[PDB]
Amino acid sequence: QHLICDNLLPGRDLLLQTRLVNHVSSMRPNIFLGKKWYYELMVDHTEPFVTAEATHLRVGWASTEGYSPYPGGGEEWGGNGVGDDLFSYGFDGLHLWSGCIARTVSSPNQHLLRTDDVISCCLDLSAPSISFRINGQPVQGMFENFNIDGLFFPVVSFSAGIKVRFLLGEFKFLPPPGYAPCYEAVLPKEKLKVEHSREYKQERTYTRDLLGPTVSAFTPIPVDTSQIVLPPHLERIREKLAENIHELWVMNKIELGWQYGPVRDDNKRQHPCLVEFSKLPEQERNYNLQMSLETLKTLLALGCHVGISDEHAYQLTSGYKPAPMDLSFIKLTPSQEAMVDKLAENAHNVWARDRIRQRRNPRLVPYALLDDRTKKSNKDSLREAVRTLLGYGYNLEARFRIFRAEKTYAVKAGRWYFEFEAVTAGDMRVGWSRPGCQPDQELGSDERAFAFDGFKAQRWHQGNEHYGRSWQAGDVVGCMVDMTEHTMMFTLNGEILLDDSGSELAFKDFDVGDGFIPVCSLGVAQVGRMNFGKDVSTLKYFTICGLQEGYEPFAVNTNRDITMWLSKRL
Amino acid sequence: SDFHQYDTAFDLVTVTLGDEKGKVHESIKRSNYMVCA
Amino acid sequence: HVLWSRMPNQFLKVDVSRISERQGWLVQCLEPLQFMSLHIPEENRSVD
Amino acid sequence: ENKYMPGLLRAGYYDLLIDIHLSSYATARLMMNNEFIVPMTEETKSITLFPDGLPGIGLSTSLRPRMQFSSPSFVSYSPEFPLDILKAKTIQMLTEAVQEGSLHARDPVGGTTEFLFVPLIKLFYTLLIMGIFHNEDLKHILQLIEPSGLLQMKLPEPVKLQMCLLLQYLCDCQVRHRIEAIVAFSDDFVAKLQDNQRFR
């Protein structure tokens, strides 16, 4: 018995060695970053020992494609810093992790993460300059040469009786190394909502519902318009368009009390380009001549035929007053107004590319990601420019999740029930399967799975078979195996779905093999809940159909929850 | 063992130290990992 | 061994008690909760 | 504490906590529960013989040698553990098992009712022998079982086998209490009798 030990047990690697680990809670504050970036963090409570463990408090960065923090379910005892996309920091003896490697960069404090410290973080775009600070004291620059795919985000992960702080802006402390605060990318349309990081689950009111998996260098670049040839057939109509685009721009100003003046001054209400398309020369009138040529070139950029289909065809102002047409009565097509958004996008990205040189003007982003008010002035220039083409008669013509319950409850006898109350619609394959279903394949795409893509209405044994209905957001699906007469029934809010062959029984005349497992799927970004008894009153349509036909909920059996499985994105 | 990159590719990793400012403290490591032709 | 794309993994019956805010972003998780976890040594990775 | 721990694994670790820690002092007292060597002290003199029955009357004389636990240290003999943290968990575990068993849940914690009950009661019984559960905890165990319930239930084969051995020390607690009583009589009786030994 001594001899069994020494040859086997101190070696520690032939047996399956084990150790308790605190449940790593991972987070993220909603906001992707891909310029030089910066954020801050203060600690409020730690409790460094409430277990027989130093309670962890890791701070760093991670990518979108990569870092799926399944809780403690990756490499050696899980957690933060474990990934090659993870670069964590902050602990008893502050130093970092990279692939969970506790390399030992020193500091002017060597102090534990306690209830007092202020963590100062940084990152650059295209420069991998990541180095953090405690209370604004340099911690000896660390991180270099890492790839950038997706957009990096703050992470902070920890587990004890902890409250801490971000500081994003509502700061308390901010030196400028690198620089831009993290409040700068709150802008686009999204508000901030801090979440639990990538989250196969979420804990809700009925029981826990299912989210999976996700949907993922923002530099503004226009498409080239100068390498596009306009024939002299179209140059004359373009100069007719440039003659129309100049005087409507003259009419666009003078409604606000403007007038012609040689001094180019906006406060004095005098502008040098309100006098005619002919009298302003071809560098002063080329603000309207070249912009109507490059618009019809950008029409030929996106693959559109801007050609002769029809023959080309009031407030008195203070210096020039013609009368072109009636333009907004002729209705633009949806392909034509989309090109007006394209002319708004292509021209503004030229200015965003030209202001790469020129710090950091607040509209230095692409046209799609900026706010909708700067989108109004760029579209209304190109929506009226689209009305000059239709007014003159020129037509413009333009992975997945797998869910299954506990294999012990691969039920084998009787009439059983569960339900699928469904929240968001998409690829939602719901049903039953034998335990031999490879989650490595897509769901329902074999002989061992009896599934039902709820939305799109098609049911799944060995591929397509249409059936039933497609559910609306907030419909209970309901699945009903009869183990005796080997049939399987579907409902939709307690309303039994008929075959396209003419019967209520969905999957009919299988054989009971090795039990059957309750099975659902998720597409790209869809949400669903699987309630398996436990609260028999919350079975919303088992009361209608069910109790009558003698079906069984799951947790009539149990007193515990059913711990399901999913195939990881990892 | 930490590798979850299911791509058809060359994708991936160096750490530096400091000496209270640095001044070198550069060379530590490279792997993540390895590629030939 | 081949890096196959996906194999089943647990629901992890109890995980998180997260709390956060807007004006100051007061991040908070409370309950001390642990794994019954091992690691297989010779193809090293950790499972529970 | 683990519920979603598998059935096989449940039985193992419960056996470890016995075999790593409890087993040696447990089997130490298995021999000595049949020995019954008692002093003639005042606490031995007192014991009542009766409720003025109850097996968990802890007047707790005759020897039954004492466990002495060495802390796990690598500077160098019975490995030490939180006995008193553990004992409260076990009553917690039983009432987690009895109540869920009496409401007839077919979850059960291991996967079968075997692994639900057996290696807990084994852990209990090994802990029962070792002279723990100060004598209001055992009254709670009798409230859990007699009731004056776990024993009421249908139990499978090796389940009730373990309950059988469980019940045996309970009968042995009746036995020692009667033996501690009869010494309480005889110490009083011989002192009367030694007077009658010397009227001569």
Side-chain angles (χ1 to χ4, degrees), chain A residues 88-237 239-240 242-244 246-263 265 270-279 281-283 292-297 301 303-304 306-309 313-320 322-328 330-331:
Chain A
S88 72
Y89 174 75
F91 200 65
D92 167 74
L94 295 168
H95 63 83
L96 62 91
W97 286 276
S98 67
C100 194
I101 303 172
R103 291 180 185 159
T104 57
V105 178
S106 67
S107 63
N109 288 322
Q110 295 302 111
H111 181 67
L112 286 76
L113 257 70
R114 289 186 181 177
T115 59
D116 300 328
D117 296 327
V118 177
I119 301 159
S120 180
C121 299
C122 182
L123 171 57
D124 300 337
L125 177 61
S126 298
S129 295
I130 297 169
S131 305
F132 293 166
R133 288 182 186 167
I134 298 302
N135 295 322
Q137 295 181 351
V139 199
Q140 299 178 0
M142 297 172 294
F143 292 108
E144 290 298 332
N145 288 321
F146 307 117
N147 295 320
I148 301 189
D149 181 8
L151 289 76
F152 294 95
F153 60 94
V155 172
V156 182
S157 299
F158 59 94
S159 186
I162 292 170
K163 69 173 298 301
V164 286
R165 295 186 67 190
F166 293 97
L167 292 171
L168 302 177
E170 289 289 329
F171 285 106
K172 180 262 181 300
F173 184 72
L174 63 164
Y179 192 68
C182 185
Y183 198 74
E184 293 289 332
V186 182
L187 291 172
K189 186 165 69 209
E190 286 193 331
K191 311 152 162 189
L192 179 275
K193 285 171 285 157
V194 189
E195 68 174 345
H196 321 259
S197 190
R198 180 68 56 88
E199 288 301 306
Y200 64 93
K201 66 100 176 184
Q202 70 270 18
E203 60 178 351
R204 291 188 185 173
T205 63
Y206 299 100
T207 321
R208 294 189 176 185
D209 306 359
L210 300 175
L211 177 61
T214 29
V215 182
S216 62
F218 65 95
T219 60
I221 294 169
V223 71
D224 292 333
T225 62
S226 181
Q227 303 153 1
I228 291 158
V229 177
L230 295 175
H233 308 281
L234 293 173
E235 290 180 349
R236 290 168 199 153
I237 290 94
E239 288 167 8
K240 288 177 184 191
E243 185 180 1
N244 292 315
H246 185 74
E247 53 84 24
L248 292 171
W249 179 65
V250 173
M251 183 65 200
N252 202 347
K253 290 182 71 66
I254 305 172
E255 300 179 352
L256 296 178
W258 292 82
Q259 191 169 15
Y260 178 70
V263 302
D265 290 333
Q270 295 175 5
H271 193 273
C273 301
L274 299 172
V275 156
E276 307 171 355
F277 179 79
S278 66
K279 302 173 178 177
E282 298 287 327
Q283 290 169 354
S292 297
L293 294 170
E294 299 298 326
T295 302
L296 292 176
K297 289 177 181 184
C304 300
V306 33
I308 302 164
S309 67
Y314 179 81
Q315 300 184 3
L316 298 171
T317 60
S318 64
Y320 175 60
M325 282 298 288
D326 189 77
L327 286 80
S328 176
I330 316 207
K331 186 174 290 296

Side-chain angles (χ1 to χ4, degrees), chain A residues 409-450:
Chain A
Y409 301 104
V411 298
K412 195 179 298 184
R415 295 173 181 266
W416 293 97
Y417 183 77
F418 75 94
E419 79 273 17
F420 186 72
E421 184 176 359
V423 180
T424 61
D427 297 321
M428 299 294 286
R429 300 187 179 176
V430 173
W432 286 86
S433 80
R434 288 177 181 156
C437 285
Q438 304 190 335
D440 186 72
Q441 286 175 357
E442 279 159 16
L443 193 141
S445 65
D446 56 349
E447 68 276 5
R448 298 167 176 176
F450 300 96

Side-chain angles (χ1 to χ4, degrees), chain A residues 187-189 218 220 345 349 364-368 370 372 375:
Chain A
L187 291 172
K189 186 165 69 209
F218 65 95
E345 183 177 5
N349 287 322
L364 284 173
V365 292
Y367 178 78
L370 49 89
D372 298 332
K375 294 182 179 178

Side-chain angles (χ1 to χ4, degrees), chain A residues 66-85:
Chain A
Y67 179 61
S68 299
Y70 293 93
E75 292 294 324
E76 294 155 352
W77 310 115
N80 195 359
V82 299
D84 294 330
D85 299 341

Side-chain angles (χ1 to χ4, degrees), chain A residues 409 557-561 563, chain D residues 3-4 96 100 105-107:
Chain A
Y409 301 104
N557 296 319
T558 71
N559 201 2
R560 294 296 180 276
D561 291 333
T563 57
Chain D
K3 267 80 68 178
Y4 294 106
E96 189 175 2
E100 292 178 358
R106 63 169 297 273
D107 184 77

